């Protein structure tokens, strides 16, 4: 049936534009950060606890486990 009637509703263009802009910026910064974190975890991360050698004193950033924390 060709009884298609017009639906009066407020303009959703601005809400969609704001949502798209927010998603675009958040992803624009988060996707590189997520990729970098994954590469760091897979390739470099997860140092394992050891014993301090005699006569050697560690530096301040050598007492942490995660590479990004160090």
């Amino acid at each position: 049936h060709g009884k298609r009637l017009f639906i009066i509703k407020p303009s959703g263009f601005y809400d969609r534009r704001f949502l798209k802009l927010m998603r675009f910026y958040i992803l624009l910064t988060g996707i590189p950060v997520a990729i970098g974190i994954t590469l760091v975890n897979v390739f470099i991360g997860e140092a394992e606890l050891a014993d301090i050698p005699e006569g050697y004193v560690p530096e301040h950033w050598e007492y942490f486990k995660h590479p990004i924390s160090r």
């Binding site: 407020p10 303009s11 601005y14 809400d15 534009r17 704001f18 802009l21 927010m22």
Partner: protein
């Protein structure tokens, strides 16, 4: 600590030497950059503190407040950008200058190794707020509101200066570190009772206490949106920070002394939450909700247990963000309607759906829905009060229920139902307002992932 202070000072020449149509852009960008700089302070230790120098130190009670104070300025600028459009460049620059000075005073207040410096900055924050309220205010009662706000504060704080100078004359130092390590018991004496009152009432008036809360509805209703934001988000927390800092010297006198205040706050939270039910104004309703939350914070500080302090810190941060968001929403409604009364503009969910979603999220986070930090502070304070006395819960219970009621009431009166037929100037919500709400709400839901970051030094 100067790595934060100096950029804030440089914000002033940058604003005053800015091009006539680039002040807002320059101010927002550099404020956000300064906020990013402030994030470094969050990495606290389980040891004493972050003592930068003889003048300024950092603490995990001071660090969240500093971060919130820095984060608030871009939001205030974005909120103020709207209604200052028909205004000359000089007066807009003066407004931005006042906001920058307020931030600088708050930043120096929160570090403040010495109590007299803390008092000086604590009262220096008063002038920019008074000028903002009494200058860029719409109604004719802004003068009376400014007078109330000034004189309540000064009547509360004038005995505090005398008490502080007396304490330094006797003890010999007003430094926080020295005071904590050399704290000695206060004998239950009339002079000690009055010293306790002078030390406590100044911070009690700014919370504010239920007896002394009158200035706040006037100041919140009559101030512009930036003024309301800074009053609800940061300026109310100064009293709580001051109490947590100064209470150490007060013991063991606090137990006997605390009863009048504990009763006033436990009954005043109920009174103000009930007042919220019958209100014809959005701003007054938000102000009374703030009064109820700060009464609960007063109870937490007066109980003076570790869980009390963690709950008070979390509740202060959460309330600051939530109340700033609520005032922003009310101002967005007002800028379209110009009435600032709930019952006039109705059914706004049909016309503005995303703004209705923002309203729902703000009302839910004001309602203390878990696992938001609002309920984290709520529950920590409630548990501490229950350990203090098993009867307090009953009052707390009522409070929670009443809170939910008026929150959803504010959600139902303005968003649900049928839109008023006559109003036709309700234009679609701008990107600026939606960004403002998003920047208000995202930090709360990010912080609920890491609650320890806002739980204070007793974590």
């Amino acid at each position: 600590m100067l790595k934060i202070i100096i950029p804030t000072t440089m914000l002033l020449p940058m604003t005053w030497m800015s091009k006539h149509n680039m002040i807002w852009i320059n101010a927002t960008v550099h404020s956000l950059l300064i906020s990013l700089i402030s994030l470094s302070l969050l990495n606290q230790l389980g040891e004493n503190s972050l003592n930068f120098s003889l003048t300024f130190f950092s603490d995990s009670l001071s660090a969240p407040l500093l971060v919130l104070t820095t984060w608030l300025l871009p939001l205030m600028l974005m909120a103020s950008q709207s209604h200052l459009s028909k205004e000359t460049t000089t007066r807009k620059k003066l407004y931005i200058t006042m906001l920058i000075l307020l931030q600088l005073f708050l930043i120096m207040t929160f570090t403040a190794t010495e109590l007299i410096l803390f008092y000086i900055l604590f009262e220096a924050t008063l002038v920019p707020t008074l000028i903002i309220i009494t200058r860029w205010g719409n109604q004719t009662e802004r003068l009376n509101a400014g007078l109330y706000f000034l004189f309540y504060t000064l009547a509360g704080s004038l005995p505090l200066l005398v008490a502080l100078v007396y304490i330094q004359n006797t003890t010999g130092s007003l430094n926080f570190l020295i005071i904590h390590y050399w704290s000695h018991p206060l004998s239950n004496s009339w002079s000690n009772i009055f010293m306790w009152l002078a030390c406590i009432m100044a911070f009690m008036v700014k919370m504010p206490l239920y007896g002394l809360h009158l200035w706040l509805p006037k100041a919140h209703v009559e101030a512009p949106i930036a003024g309301s934001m800074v009053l609800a988000a940061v300026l109310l927390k100064l009293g709580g920070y001051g109490m947590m800092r100064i209470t150490t010297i007060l013991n063991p006198l606090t137990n006997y002394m605390a009863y009048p205040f504990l009763m006033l706050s436990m009954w005043g939270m109920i009174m103000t939450s009930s007042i919220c039910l019958r209100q014809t104004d959005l701003k007054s309703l938000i102000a009374y909700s703030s009064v109820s939350h700060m009464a609960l914070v007063i109870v937490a500080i007066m109980i003076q247990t570790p869980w009390s302090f963690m709950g008070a810190t979390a509740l202060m941060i959460a309330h600051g963000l939530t109340s700033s968001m609520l005032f922003c929403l009310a101002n967005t409604n007002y800028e379209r309607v110009h009435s600032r009364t709930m019952i006039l503009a109705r059914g706004l969910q049909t016309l503005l759906p995303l703004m209705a979603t923002w309203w729902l999220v703000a009302s839910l986070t004001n309602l203390a829905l878990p696992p938001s930090i609002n309920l984290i502070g709520e529950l920590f304070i409630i548990t501490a009060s229950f350990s203090w006395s098993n009867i307090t819960i009953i009052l707390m219970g009522m409070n929670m229920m009443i809170t939910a009621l008026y929150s959803l009431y504010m959600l139902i009166t303005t968003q649900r139902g049928k839109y008023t037929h006559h109003i036709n100037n309700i234009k679609p919500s701008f990107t600026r307002e939606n960004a403002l709400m998003a920047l208000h709400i995202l930090p709360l839901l990010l912080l609920t992932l890491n609650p320890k970051m806002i739980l204070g030094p007793l974590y």
